Curated annotation (Swiss-Prot):
Residue stretches spanning the membrane: none
Species: Finegoldia magna (Peptostreptococcus magnus)
Protein's job: Binds serum albumin.
S-S bridge residues: none
Domain of life: Bacteria
Protein name, per record: Peptostreptococcal albumin-binding protein
Positions of the UniProt region annotated as GA module: 1-53
Localization per Swiss-Prot or TrEMBL: Secreted, Cell wall
C-alpha cells in the first residue's frame, strides 16, 4: 500500500512559497512532482540551491 507515492501534495504547498523566493525556472518546479514524498519534494528544492546557480 504505497499510493502516497504519486505525491502531488507538497508541489503546491511548496511552490506557493518558493515562487516568491525568486526561483521561477520550470525545470525545478515541474520536477517537484516527480518527488516521491514530501521529503523528496522539499529535498529537490534544496538541490536548486547548488544544482542551479
Amino acid at each position: 500500500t504505497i499510493d502516497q507515492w504519486l505525491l502531488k501534495n507538497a508541489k503546491e504547498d511548496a511552490i506557493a512559497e518558493l515562487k516568491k523566493a525568486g526561483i521561477t525556472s520550470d525545470f525545478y518546479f515541474n520536477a517537484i512532482n516527480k518527488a516521491k514524498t514530501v521529503e523528496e519534494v522539499n529535498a529537490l528544492k534544496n538541490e536548486i540551491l547548488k544544482a542551479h546557480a
